[PDB]
Amino acid sequence: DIQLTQSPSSLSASVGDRVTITCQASQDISNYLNWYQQKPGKAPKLLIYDASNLGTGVPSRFSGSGSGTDFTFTISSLQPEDIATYYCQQADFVPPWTFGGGTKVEIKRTVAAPSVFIFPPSDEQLKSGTASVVCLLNNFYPREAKVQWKVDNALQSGNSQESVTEQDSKDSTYSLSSTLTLSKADYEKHKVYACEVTHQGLSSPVTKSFNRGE
Amino acid sequence: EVQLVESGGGLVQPGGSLRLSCAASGFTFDDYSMNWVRQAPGKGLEWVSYISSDADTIYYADSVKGRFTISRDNAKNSLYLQMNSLRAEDTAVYYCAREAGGVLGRVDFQHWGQGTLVTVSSASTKGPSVFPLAPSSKSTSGGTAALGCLVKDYFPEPVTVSWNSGALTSGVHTFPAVLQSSGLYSLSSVVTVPSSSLGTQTYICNVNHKPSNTKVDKKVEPK
Amino acid sequence: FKVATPYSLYVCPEGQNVTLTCRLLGPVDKGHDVTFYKTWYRSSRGEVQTCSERRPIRQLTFQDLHLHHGGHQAAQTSHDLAQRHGLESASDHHGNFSITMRNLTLLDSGLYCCLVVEIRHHHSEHRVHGAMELQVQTGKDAPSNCVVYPSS
Ligand SMILES: *[C@@H]1O[C@H](CO)[C@@H](O)[C@H](O)[C@H]1NC(C)=O
């Protein structure tokens, strides 16, 4: 079984920068290497076939080369829409047709401030007997961040779950949402609610809040 | 154009069976070789099985051999994958893919389908509970309001969430599903809109959950 | 193990049947626990490598014409191919590996490659191939029967 080692596993590069991905085959595979692109949500899409042959309606900034064991895929000038995971795939005579493992391409951007929002639990949900609060952080860069859940000035620990989107195809930003899930009992105890956000784009940590009862 | 619609995926218990279909159109299905390729959640691609144009040659990955059986109905423009003795590891999105054929006799996978999720789990089907995320009076950041729905406690994946029956696409951020200590998934779908048109325009998220047949709408107004 | 090509060029008229042959000289099978993927395809005399590119024979790829079997066994392609496409790939015990082509046409002309792939330990690194031309001719200048030219 032919193993394909694909390098690097992840990648960050600016709009315009050359980007080169590498596939290393454990045997001679002649030029029998196909290169696919998988955008988040979409299925894979063939870009290159047999190492260097471009598909139809595929931007000419995409190219590939290599033979035997060492192969490359290259984007001439990385564009925002080229955010995807790229796979290599060997097309040998014999059946076990294996793939690379993939190179995630995220794009480098100027720092951007998260437009923060917060939302209370619904009445419909409170009838059911739970209290969830969503703290949104909208359209920012870089991806890394800290959201501190606090209830009447008391740091929360191990009672929430964060979730962050894939990078946008145009403005190259992310979004983050964090869900502090509590019962109806513990919700009605303490009064004020807020999530404190820390980021590079925000020098002073921004906070949003709501006084319970409105 | 060539089009490949997978179907038949869903929840099934360990040891259980399930059958996927791939509906081909926009090319002579007769002439081309077809593959199945699976992608486990958040992981790389794995080839599963191969099938010749008239089915004379058939191959399987070792991980599926003995269990899965590939076939095609050239009269019906259809490709099948019987799946038996399913394990935890078989949980994946399954794409049928048509090999670029032609006079050059190519072998690359030029046409893929959108795929069909197969979940393998002893846990039960469970529909969601949609709760609105209302745009408060002091949460419209400089003439820019933000609102959403909270699709909570469902299993398995996936749900699909649109806004105003698909007519509102711009501004939307449907987040990834998040597994919980419940054992159930939860996500939120949000959208940013001008705060001046809060009263003017009506905003409705259209949740859908085909495993439990839970189609749901939910109006979102300030509260 | 190596593959020998007895004839380098085949010259035939349209309508004939011709059988291309590769001889698998010396099997080199240290007992069993080894299978052989054997196939035919068309290619070019390229700059870098020969029998690199894989083109079909009458709209049939290398996978269509392939034979998979252990060293001890013989193998043949199904009657469906012979009837429909006019191609019969065959492989016997006594070295011989062939493809037979019914009712020759000008489109059959080209460079033909036999491949033999040793599969052992779930690995298939050990591979050899041969190459030979076919020239299908037309007219009164074209010969009565097929003619093959020995290799150097
Ligand atoms: C080629 O093979 C066919 C099928 O067996 C046979 O009928 C035919 O006579 C052969 N052609 C020639 C020119 O001998």
Numbering used by the authors:
A (entry chain L): 1 to 214
B (entry chain H): 1 to 223
C (entry chain P): 33 to 184
Excerpt from the publication:
VISTA (V-domain immunoglobulin (Ig) suppressor of T-cell activation), a B7 family member, promotes T-cell and myeloid quiescence and represents a promising target, especially in combination with anti-PD-1/PD-L1 treatment. VISTA is predominantly expressed on myeloid cells, including monocytes and neutrophils, where it acts as an immune checkpoint to suppress T-cell activation. Importantly, VISTA is only active at low pH (~pH 6), as found in the TME, due to protonation of surface exposed histidine residues, enabling its binding to PSGL-17,8. The extracellular domain (ECD) of VISTA, an IgV-type domain, has a significantly higher histidine content compared to other B7 family and type I transmembrane proteins (14 surface exposed histidines out of total 168 residues).
We developed SNS-101, a fully human monoclonal IgG1 antibody (mAb) that is cross-reactive to cynomolgus monkey VISTA but not to mouse VISTA. SNS-101 is specific for the protonated (active) form of VISTA. To elucidate the exact nature of SNS-101’s pH-selective binding, we co-crystallized the VISTA-ECD with a SNS-101 Fab fragment. The structure of VISTA:SNS-101 Fab at 2.59 Å resolution revealed that five out of fourteen histidines of VISTA-ECD (His98, His100, His117, His154 and His155) are located at the interface of this complex. Among all interface histidine residues, only single histidine mutations His98 (KD = 9.5 nM), His100 (KD = 7.5 nM) and His117 (KD = 4.7 nM) significantly decreased binding affinity by 14-, 11- and 7-fold, respectively. Single mutant variants Arg159Ala and Phe94Ala reduced the binding affinity 180-fold (KD = 122 nM) and 86-fold (KD = 59 nM) respectively, while Arg86Ala entirely eliminated the interaction with SNS-101. Arginine 159, positioned within 3 Å of Asp92 of the SNS-101 light chain (SNS-101-Fab:LC), is crucial for the high-affinity interaction. Mutating Asp92 nearly eradicated the interaction between SNS-101 and VISTA, indicating the importance of hydrogen bonds (H-bonds) between Arg159:VISTA and Asp92:SNS-101-Fab:LC. The diminished binding affinity in Arg86Ala and Phe94Ala variants can be explained by H-bonds between Arg86:VISTA and the backbone carbonyl oxygen of Asp92/Ala91 of SNS-101-Fab:LC, and -π-π-interactions between Phe94:VISTA and Phe93 of SNS-101-Fab:LC. Nevertheless, SNS-101’s epitope (Arg159, His155, His154, His117, His100, His98, Arg86, Phe94) is distinct, involves more histidine residues and covers a larger VISTA-ECD surface area than BMS767 (His153, His154, Glu157, Val149, Leu147, Phe94, Gln95, Arg86, Thr71, Tyr69).
